[PDB]
Amino acid sequence: VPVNPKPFLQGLIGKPVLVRLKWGQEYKGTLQSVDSYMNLQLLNAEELVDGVKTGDLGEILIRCNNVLWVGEV
Template sequence: MSGFTPINPRPMLQALVDKDVIIRLKWGQEYHGKLISVDSYMNIQMRGADEWIDGKSTGNLGEVLIRCNNVLWISALDAAGKEVEMAG
């Protein structure tokens, strides 16, 4: 019988600090920008954040704070602005 082993996401999030990321919220909005910090509750601070709704940019919001319980997923971006495949 195979078992499920939970993985702590904090080391991955800390590795993304000062890198460009995409953060998707539960309601479909995405925020593209530089991850500045993550606290112990996994609240997220971004700088240079652009908001995307339905695949279209709605503008630059600058510095934002995203509460942890709103986040659906987080992905790193490479230098070309493409999502990075993250393996666990």
């Protein structure tokens, strides 16, 4: 039974989520809002670079160009 990207991101909102970039980095955190262009927003995010935490930033938005991955923790 089909599960489409909009409905998927409309159901992912709120829960813990990890998303990569095109440049290797992968950031975990809960999701607040999703535009029509995916174009993610995060809160309480910790940047895992090569499976290693670097800097805890907090409130975040990522431009939708760089997003490689979308899934869950």
